[PDB]
Design a protein around this ligand. Structure first.
Ligand SMILES: *[C@@H]1O[C@H](CO)[C@@H](O[C@@H]2O[C@H](CO)[C@@H](O[C@@H]3O[C@H](CO)[C@@H](O)[C@H](O)[C@@H]3O)[C@H](O)[C@H]2NC(C)=O)[C@H](O)[C@H]1NC(C)=O
Ligand SMILES: CC(=O)N[C@@H]1[C@@H](O)[C@H](O)[C@@H](CO)O[C@H]1O
Ligand SMILES: *[C@@H]1O[C@H](CO)[C@@H](O)[C@H](O)[C@H]1NC(C)=O
Length: 1327
């Protein structure tokens, strides 16, 4: 389990207590804690359970923590420091900061920081399982734990910071003693289940949620459990199963420690080996099939707790020096032997079965230890059979002779059960002796095992001396100092497990440590084994505790209570621990030097002579795009390398000093360290199977330390390591050994012949596609989506983006002529050319925690009109085509420099251009053209973001619509920008203008209408400045013309606001102090007008300036220094908030930097003319009881139920869905949106399930020859994609999409639109 326990603060120098009262700190008088209790809460704050106030600051006092008054503390060595190098101290009883003491727990010896913050998750509600956020304010009272009232279901908490303004709650998930409440005390069989649906949680988050309750994730071991999970009523259609491979070199493991014998892998997944693959599994409940999906997603899960669990063990680590039949290797009473002759599986089984033996069987780590240590150096170059076969359907591995499987040791990463294969065989490979699949038809060696009979003064066990087979172990009575007579050195994990069993058998209670000969004599941070004289055995194995490395000096010991064998670090000066040793050692173990410091790098890899390894760094501009930790590791493995993993503590600083020369700005990089695997139990590990031995990470008391399990390194332009999640995108740097060769799997470098042969072949034969650049048709080479994108993307070439219907028809004809009407091709279909730099996938109303998936599309030669907006399983090998970039920044025109340069008083100048305003009179586009031509210039053409910001800042005084002035023929691309300028970017919000491709009527002789664009002034809406396209035969207002001018390329008042640009180079705290010195505060941008004005003002200064945006919750939730809700945001990236404080870049985007830095300016604001902050939502609607684990979320006098559950009845869905919503709960019909805010609410609820559902079913019919809802009511409000539909029949499916638009799929056969039914949600409102 895991929970936060209330504690007390104790001083170290003066060994007494703490006492907060209304005014200040007073005399302790504690040891009667009925009047004081402290607990850590969010934002690194301390909360008192008695006064219900949070401590803060320079007089220290208890303030209500609904304020921004530097209410946060940090984790020092053994003390606490505040905002900027502050400190916490007391003087004569009263506490006051000192800025230069230690504080420990009550009844313990640690700095209030060693135990990580264990947050709790929620089960169901309007939050979808998001973790709690304590404290929360209700009825004027601050609650720090889950409450229990007669209104809600059970223990429920608030999941966000401000509960009053969000009204998002969730039923808590607390550890229970039995499986009676919120569980199912019986299952199939011998466990209790908890099916929590509607919870968009990642794999690691779901595992942490199931583990905090003492249980674990799912575990399927027999077909009975599978068929019980299939026929369960309240279960999600797709969820997690805990099956994962998050280790370095392990095949596939269960979440809980259970053997993997029953496999149900989907036969459609091609099992992408390195790029495009995954490491966590996923279960589909409709067919009950297993897939390998990228477990960075957000899918529901299910917890499983063993019913009446018992701690049963055995004598798995014993000793028996028995003899065998003169040649059979004896080990622990058994005899193993492998035949050197080539044989099959069944034939060899029958061969060595005729003796008094049969094929080998591995039940625990003893057999694995035998297989690895013996067998001629773990069978360096060999393949050996093993008596595990499968003939059942589904797959269920079983031993040749046995009763039950108990340990599975797979090879990373291929259990690899074929589709059409009745016999399934396993074999040995790898330096760790792991298992892979075979065909029971290859000729390779085999091993088998015999039960032998039971049977020197060099090792007398008379004095309590245990034996292991080659080297005995001996424990001593007591030893206070370190290494009194002996120090122990461990070499591998099997020796560690033997030592753990010996320690558990020796002692009977907890809190007795055993010494270990690992220390740092030089106090250099790197740990090495103690030298007993002429011994320099390097560290080959390491297993620390959760966060053990904390001091660059000390001595290690081994705990035995629950952290069995975890190498803890204690003071090597004075600390008592027991001692264990061995007699023999390894003479040939540390005698090996494989790398050589004289071998150079193969090609292009840079390295310094003090590295013995070649490096290859991937900058943030050369690559196709940044990627997550797992994607970076897979990209490094594809090239034959891994992430940078240093052995010594000087190599890290040398590598940092070597990379900081290749960088100008500061940006994080990926590293091999990660604690993602559940078997590590919190300890770190290197991805290349190298034991961690140095202090690399500090101890930051983060709120989600269990979730962020990846290590990121920071470079400076002058060794700071942080813990990032496995979802953030980040550049990386692979590294290879000085003697090993790299790989080239059709990626970056092996494009060298792919830049000459196919490029010229496509430039010669294939002509230019109609209305577009050249398209190279990469066929006869099937690659995944990630591999196709990596192949197409180059210095100029990239993945083919289709934005026109003419180009669509051309590529369709070329595909039909080249490959056929059956093959599929990877195409990125859109309406306007999208920029890979700015994804524009930012929600405008709120920043809710949902990571959207990848939109990897496809298209075929036939059925292209239907499958153009349907995503596929893009871990598939298919041909593709690559497009070519043209000369963008190479065209030069406008030779007139001093003649046309004329900026009069009716002209506002900006960067290399100038604008002029006219009256807001209304004219069409063809008239507005000559209206601007009446003056000298052109219509306003936008080529960058800051020009759009300048236009937006000029917009408030203009009309509600402006003619931007770019025209294009309908159903084609956009060019010429009315001024012979290449279209760089376009600002079309996908929530207002449908980003999908437009499909016209296929019968049009010459009716080629034109489409023009305009800028909207949406009157306080967050979409002002965006562009909208329309048939410009109509007329709109015109208030702007642009021209080019060459020779001439304080307290500011703006929209009832006073802005001051401080040019001082200072931090964010000093900036806030300087703003407060002028009776002002840091600017809080709450509207796009202020954002655009501040952006153009920052461009006028050519440097990024500070703003009033900062974070306290470990960069999870941002907020303004004024106490204003973050509603408007213009971040530069989706997941780019990598540091704490915020600055406003010159390009108009909010950059994020750690505000312990120097920025060349800041922005202070003052609001005196307009001071309005009165906003409070009212929620007085209570929904009925939840049904089938699907609650009713209230919204505006209604109760919606997005039924994400097993449903396959798709026969006459019109009445079927209605009866389904009816018998589920009366007084509730199908969903029918009749407003605009309701559509946004439905879209928000859909976006939480964007990984398993892309549409929400709507109740649209065609009764009485008109589109109307199921109820007797007309259809007032509608949100279509492109015009009103033309549905004449009544057989069609209406679905609210993931962009707010309503799509309609018509069909003639009911069994043809099942793809729309598989990805739909059945919502039944109440009203
Ligand atoms: C962005 O531009 C598009 C134009 O392509 C705008 O779509 C147009 O919006 C108007 C306003 O609602 C529609 O007029 C309505 O037509 C229905 C047809 O049944 C009629 O019943 C209403 O009384 C009203 O006249 C118009 O049909 C629609 N489409 C076109 C081609 O003009 C869109 O509104 C613009 N976006 C924003 C935010 O204004
Ligand atoms: C610290 C020192 O001087 N010697 C240590 C001692 O703890 C150990 O017992 C000895 C060999 O047994 O070598 C090492
Ligand atoms: C809900 O009902 C109350 C009282 O009938 C009404 O004041 C309120 O406007 C309703 N909500 C909406 C969104 O109309």
């Amino acid at each position: 389990r895991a929970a936060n326990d209330p504690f007390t603060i104790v001083h170290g120098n003066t060994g007494k207590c703490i006492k907060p009262v209304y005014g200040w700190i007073v005399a302790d008088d504690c040891d009667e804690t009925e009047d004081k209790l402290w607990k850590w809460v969010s934002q690194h704050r301390l909360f008192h359970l008695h006064s219900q106030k949070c401590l803060g600051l320079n007089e220290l006092r208890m303030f209500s923590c609904d304020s921004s008054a530097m209410l946060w503390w940090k984790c020092e060595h053994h003390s606490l420091y505040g905002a900027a190098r502050y400190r916490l101290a007391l003087k004569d009883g009263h506490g006051t900061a000192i800025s230069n003491d230690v504080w420990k727990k009550g009844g313990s010896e640690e700095s209030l920081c060693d135990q990580p913050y264990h947050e709790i998750y929620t089960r169901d509600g309007n939050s979808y399982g998001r973790p709690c956020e304590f404290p929360f304010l209700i009825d004027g009272t601050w609650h720090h734990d889950c409450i229990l009232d007669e209104d809600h279901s059970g223990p429920w908490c608030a999941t966000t910071l401000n509960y009053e303004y969000d009204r998002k709650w969730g039923i808590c998930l607390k550890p229970e003693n039995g499986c009676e409440d919120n569980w199912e005390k019986n299952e199939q069989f011998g466990s209790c289940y908890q099916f929590n649906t509607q919870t968009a949680l990642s794999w690691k988050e779901a595992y942490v949620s199931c583990q905090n309750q003492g249980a674990d994730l799912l575990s399927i071991n027999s077909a009975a459990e599978l068929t019980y999970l299939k026929e369960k009523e309240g279960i999600a259609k797709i969820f997690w199963i805990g099956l994962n491979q998050l280790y370095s070199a392990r095949g596939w493991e269960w979440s809980d420690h259970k053997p993997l014998n029953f496999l149900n892998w989907d036969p459609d997944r091609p099992s992408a080996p390195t790029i495009g693959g995954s490491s966590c599994a996923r279960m589909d409940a409709e067919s009950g099939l297993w897939q390998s999906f990228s477990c960075e997603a957000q899918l529901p899960y299910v917890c499983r707790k063993p019913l009446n669990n018992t701690v049963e063990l055995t004598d798995v680590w014993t000793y028996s020096d028995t003899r065998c039949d003169a040649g059979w290797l004896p080990n622990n009473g058994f005899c193993y032997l492998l035949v050197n002759e080539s044989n099959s599986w069944d034939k060899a089984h029958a061969k060595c079965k005729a003796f008094s033996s049969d094929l080998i069987s591995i039940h625990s780590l003893a057999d694995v230890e035998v297989v690895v240590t013996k067998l001629h150096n773990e069978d360096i170059k060999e393949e050996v059979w093993i008596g595990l076969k499968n003939i059942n359907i589904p797959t269920l591995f079983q031993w040749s002779d046995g009763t039950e499987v108990t340990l599975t040791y797979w090879d990373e990463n291929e259990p690899n059960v074929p589709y059409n294969k009745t016999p399934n065989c396993v074999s040995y490979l790898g330096e760790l002796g792991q298992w892979k699949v075979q065909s029971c038809e290859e000729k390779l060696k085999y091993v088998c095992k015999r039960k032998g009979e039971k049977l020197d003064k060099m090792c007398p066990p008379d004095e309590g001396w245990k034996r292991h087979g080659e080297t005995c172990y001996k424990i001593y009575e007591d030893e206070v100092p370190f290494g009194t007579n002996c120090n122990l050195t461990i070499t591998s994990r099997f020796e560690q497990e033997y030592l753990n069993d010996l320690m558990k058998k020796y002692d009977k209670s907890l809190r007795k440590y055993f010494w270990t000969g690992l220390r740092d004599v030089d106090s250099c941070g790197e740990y090495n084994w103690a030298t007993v004289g002429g011994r320099r055995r390097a560290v080959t194995f390491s297993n620390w505790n959760f966060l053990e490395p904390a001091s660059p000096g000390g001595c290690v010991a081994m705990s035995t209570g629950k952290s069995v064998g975890k190498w803890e670090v204690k003071d090597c000066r004075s600390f008592k621990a027991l001692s264990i040793c061995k007699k023999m050692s390894g003479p040939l173990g540390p005698e090996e030097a494989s790398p050589k410091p004289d071998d150079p790098c193969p090609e292009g890899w840079q390295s310094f002579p003090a590295s013995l390894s070649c490096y290859k760094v991937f900058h943030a501009e050369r690559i196709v795009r940044k990627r997550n930790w797992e994607e970076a590791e897979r990209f490094c493995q594809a090239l034959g390398a891994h992430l940078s993993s240093f052995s010594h503590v000087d190599e890290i600083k040398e590598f940092l000093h070597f990379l900081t020369d290749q960088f100008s700005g500061q940006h994080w990089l990926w590293i091999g360290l990660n604690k993602r695997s559940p078997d590590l139990q919190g300890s770190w590990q290197w991805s290349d199977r190298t034991p961690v031995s140095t202090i690399i990470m500090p101890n930051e008391f983060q709120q989600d330390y269990d979730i962020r399990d990846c290590a990121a390194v920071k470079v400076f332009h002058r060794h700071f390591y942080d813990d990032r999640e496995f979802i953030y995108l980040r550049p990386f740097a692979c590294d290879t050994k000085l003697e090993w060769v790299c790989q080239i799997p059709k990626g970056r470098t092996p494009k060298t012949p792919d830049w000459y042969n196919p490029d010229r072949a496509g430039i010669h034969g294939p002509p230019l596609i109609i209305e577009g650049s050249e398209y190279w048709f990469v066929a006869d080479l099937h690659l995944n989506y990630e591999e196709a994108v990596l192949y197409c993307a180059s210095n100029h070439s990239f993945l083919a983006t289709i934005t026109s219907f003419v180009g669509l028809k051309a590529i369709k004809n070329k595909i039909a002529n080249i490959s056929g009407d059956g093959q599929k091709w990877w195409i990125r279909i859109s309406e306007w050319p999208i920029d890979d730099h700015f994804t524009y996938s930012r929600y405008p109303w709120h920043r809710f925690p949902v990571t959207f998936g990848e939109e990897c599309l496809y298209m075929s030669a036939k059925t292209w009109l239907i499958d153009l907006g349907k995503p596929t399983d893009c871990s598939t090998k298919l041909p593709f085509i690559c497009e070519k970039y043209n000369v963008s920044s190479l065209e030069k025109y406008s030779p007139d420099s001093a003649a046309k340069v004329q900026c009069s008083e009716q002209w506002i100048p900006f960067q290399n251009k100038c604008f002029l305003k006219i009256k807001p009179v209304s004219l069409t586009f063809s008239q507005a053209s000559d209206t601007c031509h009446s003056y000298g210039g052109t219509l306003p053409s936008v080529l960058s973001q800051i020009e759009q910001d300048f236009i937006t800042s000029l917009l408030p005084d203009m009309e509600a619509t402006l003619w931007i002035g770019l025209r294009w023929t309908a159903y084609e691309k956009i060019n010429k920008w009315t001024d012979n300028r290449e279209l760089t970017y376009s600002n079309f919000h996908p929530l207002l203008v449908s980003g999908r491709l437009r499909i016209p009527e296929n019968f049009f002789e010459e009716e080629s209408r034109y489409h023009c664009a305009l800028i909207l002034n949406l009157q306080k809406s967050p979409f002002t400045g965006t562009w909208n396209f329309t048939s410009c035969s109509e007329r709109h207002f015109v208030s702007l013309c642009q021209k080019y001018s060459e020779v001439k390329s304080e307290t500011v008042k703006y929209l009832n606001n006073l802005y001051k640009i401080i040019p001082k180079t200072l931090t964010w705290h000093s900036a806030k102090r300087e703003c407060l010195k002028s009776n002002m505060q840091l600017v809080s941008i709450t509207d796009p007008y202020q954002q655009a004005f501040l952006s153009v003002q920052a461009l006028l200064h050519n440097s990024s300036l500070w703003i009033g945006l900062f974070s306290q919750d470990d960069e999870l939730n941002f907020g303004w220094s004024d106490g204003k809700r973050l509603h408007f945001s213009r971040w530069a990236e989706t997941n780019g908030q990598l540091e704490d404080c915020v600055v406003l870049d010159t390009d108009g985007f909010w950059k994020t930097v750690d505000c312990n830095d120097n920025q060349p300016g800041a922005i202070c604001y003052y609001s005196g003319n307009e001071t309005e902050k009165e906003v409070k939502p009212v929620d007085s609607v209570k929904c009925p009881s939840p049904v089938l684990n699907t609650p009713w979320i209230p919204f505006q006098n209604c109760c919606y139920n997005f039924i994400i559950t097993k449903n396959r009845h798709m026969a006459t869905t019109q009445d079927e869905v209605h009866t389904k919503c009816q018998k589920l709960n009366p007084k509730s019909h199908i969903l029918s949106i009749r407003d605009e805010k309701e559509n946004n609410f439905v879209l928000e609820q859909l976006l939480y399930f964007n990984y398993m559902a892309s549409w929400v079913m709507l109740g649209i019919t065609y009764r009485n020859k008109s589109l109307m809802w199921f109820d007797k009511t007309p259809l007032s409000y509608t949100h279509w994609r492109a015009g009103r539909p033309t549905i004449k029949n009544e057989k069609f499916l209406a679905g609210l999409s993931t962009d707010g638009f309503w799509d309609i799929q018509t069909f003639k056969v009911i069994e043809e639109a099942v793809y729309f039914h598989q990805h739909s949600i059945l919502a039944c409102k109440i009203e």
